[PDB]
C-alpha cells in the first residue's frame, strides 16, 4: 500500500509567536493561518521554545502560560507540533527578524566572568549560548549548564503533561548550540562574517583553551597551541597557514587538534541528550537533535568551514557517521537543515557540493540505524526546490508493492509566513505537501504509515569515544536518483 511511502510534513512557526514579554501576541491571526495549513494537508508545526523568555525572572522562574494557550490553539487546529528546547539565543543568524537573548540573569554573570561565552582567537565573545567549557561548572547559582538545561526540560515535561499525554506533541528538538545545531558559531554574522568565508575556530574561551593545554601535555607536547595560523572568518583556505596544502591541518599537532575539538561537541550532545531522555522518560515522543549543513569548501581537501564549525569530516575521515552513532543510543532522530540545495546554485568559487554533502550524511545515518529529518536551510517557494526536498524524502523513488528502501522520518519547512500563504504560492507548496505524503491524502494517524510513537524509554548503555570514532571510516553513499519520481513539476 501506497501510505508507507508517506513523508509527514510540518512546517515552522513565525519566530516571535510569543513575544519576548512572555505574551502570545496574535491568536486569532494564527489560528487562521493554521487553519489554512491544516486544510492543506500539514502533518504538523514546529515551535522555539525559548529559554530567555521561560526562565527570565531568575533561576527556576518559570512561566509556562502563554505557551500553553499557544499549544491548546495548536490543537484546537487539528495539527501535532515538534518543540525545540531552544537554549539559544535568536537575533544574530540568517533570517532571524527579533531578538530573544538568553535569559538575563545568566547574561548578568557573563558581567563578571567572561568567559561563559564561545570566544574567538580575537577575543571576541558570542553571547548567543553558552561555551560548552562551562557544561559542568557549577557557578551559575549553584548549576552547572546541564543542570539549567535538564531542569528546564524537566519543567516542561510536568507543566504540559496533559498535552504530551494527549499525544499533541510528536518529537523534542533539544537545541545544542547556536540556531539550536550541536556546532561552535564558526560563521557569526553579528562579526562580520559572510559567505563563503572559512569561518575562525571557537576554543578561546579559558575552560576550553585550559583544558586543551591540559590534554596535549598528557599526549606528550605540553608546547602545543591552540592554531595561531587559521586565518580569519572570511578567509579563504589556501591564504592560510593551517589549511593550505601541506598545511597544518594535516600535521600531528593540527589532528591532534580537530580531533580534540570535534569531540568536544559528541560529548556535550551525548551528555545534554542523557538529560532530555530522563526528563521526557515514558513520554509518547522522540527526541532529536540539528546538524547544519555546512556546504562551502565542502569540496577541496581541507573541508575549511565544517573544520571551524566542530565537524572534522575530511576526505578520507567520515566526521558525521560517528555523530550518528552517537544518537543511537539514545533512539534519537538526525535533523539536517540543508536539504533543498543543489550544487549548481551555488558560486563556483564557493566549492560547494550541498547536493554530495546531503548523501553522506543521510547515508551515514541510515548506515547507523537511526532515523533522519530534514529541513531546508533558506525560504524557497519554486517548484525546483520542493523537487530537491522530494528527491531527498526518498532517495531511490516509492515502492509500489511496500515501504521503501530508503525514506526520511520527516522534513519540516521554513517557515510560515506571508509569502507563502500567497495564492501561487501556497498553491506550489500543496503539491509538495501531496508528493511528499505519495499522491495520498493527509492520514491523521501515524500508525498507518509506519510512524507509531511508542513510550520514550531509557538509553542504552554509554558508548566509549574510540568506538564512536570507530564510524569515521568512509563508506560509500546509497545510490541515489538523478531526479524525483514525485515531481511537483513547475
Ligand atoms: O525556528 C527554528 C530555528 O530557525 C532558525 O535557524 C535555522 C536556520 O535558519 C536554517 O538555515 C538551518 O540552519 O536550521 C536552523 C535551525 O532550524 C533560527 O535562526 C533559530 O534560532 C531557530 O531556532
Ligand atoms: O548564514 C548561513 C547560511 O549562509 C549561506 O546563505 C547565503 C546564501 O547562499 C546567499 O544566497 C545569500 O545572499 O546570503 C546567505 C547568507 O545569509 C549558505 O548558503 C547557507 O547554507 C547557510 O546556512
Not at 121 to 142: A, Q
Not at 193 to 216: H, M, N, R, S, T
Not at 227 to 239: F, L, T
Not at 291 to 308: C, D, F, Q, R
Request: one cysteine or more; glycine letters at 8%.
Amino acid at each position: 500500500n501506497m501510505l508507507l511511502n508517506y513523508v509527514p510534513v510540518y512546517v515552522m512557526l513565525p519566530l516571535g509567536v510569543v513575544n519576548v514579554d512572555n505574551v502570545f501576541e496574535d491568536p486569532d491571526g494564527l489560528k487562521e493561518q493554521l487553519l489554512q495549513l491544516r486544510a492543506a494537508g500539514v502533518d504538523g508545526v514546529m515551535v522555539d521554545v525559548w529559554w530567555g523568555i521561560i526562565e527570565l525572572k531568575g533561576p527556576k522562574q518559570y512561566d509556562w502560560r502563554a505557551y500553553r494557550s499557544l499549544l491548546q490553539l495548536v490543537q484546537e487546529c487539528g495539527l501535532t507540533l515538534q518543540a525545540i528546547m531552544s537554549f539559544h539565543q535568536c537575533g544574530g543568524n540568517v533570517g532571524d527578524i527579533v531578538n530573544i537573548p538568553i535569559p538575563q540573569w545568566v547574561l548578568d554573570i557573563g558581567e563578571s566572568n567572561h568567559d561563559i561565552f564561545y570566544t574567538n582567537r580575537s577575543g571576541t565573545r558570542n553571547k548567543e549560548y553558552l561555551t560548552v567549557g562551562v557544561d559542568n561548572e557549577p557557578i551559575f547559582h549553584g548549576r552547572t549548564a546541564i543542570e539549567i538545561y535538564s531542569d528546564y526540560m524537566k519543567s516542561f515535561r510536568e507543566n504540559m503533561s496533559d498535552f504530551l499525554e494527549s499525544g499533541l506533541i510528536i518529537d523534542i528538538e533539544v537545541g545544542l548550540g547556536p540556531a539550536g545545531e550541536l556546532r561552535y558559531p564558526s560563521y557569526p554574522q553579528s562579526q562580520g562574517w559572510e559567505f563563503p568565508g572559512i569561518g575562525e575556530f571557537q576554543c578561546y574561551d579559558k575552560y576550553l583553551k585550559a583544558d586543551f593545554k591540559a590534554a596535549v601535555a598528557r599526549a606528550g607536547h605540553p608546547e602545543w597551541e591552540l592554531p595561531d595560523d587559521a586565518g580569519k572568518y572570511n578567509d579563504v583556505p589556501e591564504s592560510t597557514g593551517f589549511f593550505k596544502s601541506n598545511g597544518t591541518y594535516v600535521t600531528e599537532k593540527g589532528k591532534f587538534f580537530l580531533t580534540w575539538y570535534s569531540n568536544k561537541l559528541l560529548n556535550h550532545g551525548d551528555q545534554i541528550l542523557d538529560e532530555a531522555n530522563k526528563a521526557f522518560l515514558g513520554c509518547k515522543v522522540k527526541l532529536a537533535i540539528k546538524v547544519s549543513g555546512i556546504h562551502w569548501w565542502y569540496k577541496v581537501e581541507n573541508h575549511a568551514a565544517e573544520l571551524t564549525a566542530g565537524y572534522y569530516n575530511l576526505n578520507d575521515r567520515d566526521g558525521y557517521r560517528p555523530i550518528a552513532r552517537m544518537l543511537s543510543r539514545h533512539h534519537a532522530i538526525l535533523t539536517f537543515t540543508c536539504l533543498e540545495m543543489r550544487d549548481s546554485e551555488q558560486p563556483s568559487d564557493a566549492k560547494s557540493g550541498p547536493q554530495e554533502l546531503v548523501q553522506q550524511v543521510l547515508s551515514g545515518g541510515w548506515r547507523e540505524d537511526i532515523r533522519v529529518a530534514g529541513e531546508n536551510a533558506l525560504p524557497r517557494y519554486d517548484a525546483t526546490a520542493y523537487n530537491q526536498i522530494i528527491l531527498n524524502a526518498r532517495p531511490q523513488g516509492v515502492n509500489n508493492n511496500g515501504p521503501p528502501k530508503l525514506s526520511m522520518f520527516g522534513v519540516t519547512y521554513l517557515r510560515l509566513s506571508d509569502d507563502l500563504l500567497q495564492k501561487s504560492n501556497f498553491n506550489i507548496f500543496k503539491k509538495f505537501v501531496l508528493k511528499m505524503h505519495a499522491d495520498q491524502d493527509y492520514c491523521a494517524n501515524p500508525q498507518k504509515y509506519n510512524h507509531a510513537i511508542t513510550p520514550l524509554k531509557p538509553s542504552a548503555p554509554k558508548i566509549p569515544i574510540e568506538v564512536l570514532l570507530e564510524a569515521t571510516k568512509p563508506t560509500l553513499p546509497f545510490p541515489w536518483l538523478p531526479e524525483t519520481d514525485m515531481k511537483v513539476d513547475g
